[PDB]
């Protein structure tokens, strides 16, 4: 039945991504005094189906003519890693329970950059290669803070096991303990997912389409699905890490509802941010991380090391 | 006479410094912009349900040209060619011959809707209120040739839209 | 075997989609459509590496907090963090952090 569980994790996540697209469109429209897609189906519920079918039936252009193996691997790697990163998350029981699921997710996120790295290069264009390079720098720059902030907050968890986060936050959300870290981590998620105001990679206003400028029809759809799946997964990781939920062992449905609602709130926050702010300049993006954030994260890491010792609140290892 | 944008000096008192440090660290202005967007989210959208809902227009609207007739049914245009002269894009081609009844009528009246600029001239020049840009705006065509109107097409448009055109002229004829 | 199964299933699903998106829509009949500067700012990438090394060195800290010699552990942890901060400060002050 384990394969059944794998499918139950995979297909609903893809459907959620498809409808997250519609949700984004409608929310952005309403914050711009507009109405989202509503002609295609009741209240626009059938729009993602139309979008997908239109994309698939569309011409498969491919002037890459260089390392087509890479030009095909990049979408595969992106989608596969986006689906895999969902596996260790405890909602409330994880599909795969790892002692170090957190470091596993960090490694998978680091790997997922290779999808953008290769796609842009195998495209063998101008915007594609330079845009891919800007991507590497962006994700790489925020990966540092992501790890430090994650280590700082888990110092209270006592392990890298995602499941124990529920136990640690049983009485209070960890945001109350580490809100500065929470803010920096949220911005870090935004940067890692390449979302506005850090949507420099794609960067349509500046780069025609970025790394996916030479990707069309299905491969572009897979990149879109990977992007949105990463958005939902990172927001779910935020919800588990900071906005903990009550878990009744006999009725997991309550925790599942609470967790889903919090992740939806965070994704809506992502769309809200995309609507509000303009895009940070490539240079300003790095200035905000290495020169502004990296320091405060180091100080807070020292503090979160020191606090359990000086407050005798060292969490149990098991 | 002149006003200085910017040109303001921040206070250096500890309270003001603390406030600005809070703004930088706690992202207050970003939160204000976020709240503005949230309020706009909860405001009613301005979209009209086209085609079921149509945008407002005034009686002086300038759309598809339409040759009109007298109440008797005789075509108003009297081959003055004044419209062709004022036409700023030379989209009007007029040919006339004395008709069998002996009246001065147009054998050819072509308005190239692909060269016309919808200036509103001719409508204000025709001494007999013949060519009058109708209220219709949704007359897109699938081929270029359909937009090269003929006198028959113009007269058919006038017959089709006369009910609205007469009312609009009645509304606006006093302002002219 | 569970983790191996998950990896296999995900990879196969993604590759299956890539197949149905690279070859299946490629059948549809059509016609003919015809169709770097040396980045010295790569220093940022290199600095990421040496900082990622400290990242790795710092990961054992949650289990390091479980020792009985908490004094020595705390001193060494703050030593590593202060050395990282010193490295960042040095690169900052020497204009080495010339991003873009």
């Amino acid at each position: 039945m384990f394969m059944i569980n794998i499918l139950s994790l995979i297909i609903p996540i893809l459907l959620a991504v498809a409808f997250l697209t519609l949700v984004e469109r409608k929310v952005l429209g309403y914050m711009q005094l507009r109405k989202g897609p509503n002609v295609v189906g009741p209240y626009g519920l059938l729009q993602p189906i139309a979008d997908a079918l239109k994309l698939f039936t569309k011409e498969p252009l491919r002037p890459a003519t260089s390392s087509i193996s890479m030009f095909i691997i990049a979408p595969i790697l992106a989608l596969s890693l986006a689906l895999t990163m969902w596996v260790p998350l405890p909602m409330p029981y994880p599909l795969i329970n790892m002692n170090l699921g957190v470091l596993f997710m960090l490694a998978m996120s680091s790997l997922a950059v290779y999808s953008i790295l290769w796609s842009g290069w195998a495209s063998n264009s101008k915007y594609a290669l330079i845009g891919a390079l800007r991507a590497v720098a962006q994700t790489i720059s925020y990966e540092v803070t992501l790890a430090i902030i994650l280590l700082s907050v888990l110092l209270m968890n006592g392990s890298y096991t995602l499941s124990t986060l529920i136990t640690t936050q049983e009485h209070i959300w960890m945001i109350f303990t580490s809100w500065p870290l929470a803010m920096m981590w949220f911005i870090s998620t935004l940067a890692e997912t390449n979302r506005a105001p850090f949507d420099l990679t794609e960067g349509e206003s500046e780069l025609v389409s970025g790394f996916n400028v030479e990707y069309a029809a299905g491969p572009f759809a897979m990149f879109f699905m990977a992007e949105y799946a990463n958005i939902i997964m990172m927001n779910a990781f935020t919800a588990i890490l900071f906005l903990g939920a009550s878990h009744d062992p006999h009725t997991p449905e309550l925790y599942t509802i609470n967790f889903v609602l919090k992740t939806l709130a965070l994704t809506i926050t992502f769309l809200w941010i995309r609507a509000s702010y303009p895009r940070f300049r490539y240079d300003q993006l790095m200035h905000l991380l290495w020169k502004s954030f990296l320091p405060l994260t180091l100080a807070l890491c020292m503090w979160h090391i020191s606090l359990p010792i000086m407050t005798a609140s060292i969490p149990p290892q098991s | 006479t002149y006003k200085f944008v910017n040109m303001r000096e921040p206070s250096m008192d500890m309270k003001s410094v603390t406030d600005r440090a809070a703004q930088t660290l706690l992202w207050t202005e970003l939160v204000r912009g976020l709240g503005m967007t949230l309020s706009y989210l909860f405001r009613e959208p301005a979209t009209i349900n086209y085609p079921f809902e149509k945008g407002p227009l005034s009686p002086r609207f300038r759309g598809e040209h339409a040759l009109r007739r007298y109440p008797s049914g005789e075509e108003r245009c009297i081959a003055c060619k004044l419209c062709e002269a004022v036409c700023p894009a030379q989209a009007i081609t007029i040919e006339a011959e004395p008709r069998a009844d002996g009246s001065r009528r147009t054998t050819r009246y072509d308005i190239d809707m692909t060269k016309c600029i919808y200036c509103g001239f001719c409508q204000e020049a025709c001494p007999v209120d013949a060519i009058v840009e109708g209220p219709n705006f949704e007359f897109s065509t699938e081929t270029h040739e359909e937009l090269l109107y003929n006198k028959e097409k113009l007269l058919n448009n006038g017959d089709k839209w006369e009910a609205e055109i007469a009312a609009n002229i009645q509304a606006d004829y006093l302002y002219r | 075997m569970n983790i191996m199964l998950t990896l296999l299933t995900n990879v196969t699903l993604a590759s299956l989609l890539v197949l149905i998106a690279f070859w299946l829509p490629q059948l549809n009949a059509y016609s003919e459509k015809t169709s770097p500067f040396s980045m010295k700012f790569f220093l940022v990438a290199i600095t990421f590496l040496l900082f990622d090394l400290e990242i790795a060195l710092l990961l054992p800290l949650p289990w390091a907090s479980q020792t009985n010699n908490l004094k020595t552990m705390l001193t060494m942890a703050l030593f590593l963090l202060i050395l990282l901060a010193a490295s960042l400060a040095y690169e900052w002050t020497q204009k080495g952090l010339e991003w873009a």
Binding site: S292, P295, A299, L300, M302, W303 | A21, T24, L25 | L81
Partner: peptide, 26 residues
Amino acid sequence: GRIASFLKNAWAKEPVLVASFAIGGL
């Protein structure tokens, strides 16, 4: 005296560094 001036300038121009150094010192 001059230390207070340095602290005021630092908080006005580089508040993040001031916060980081304070937290690390504590």
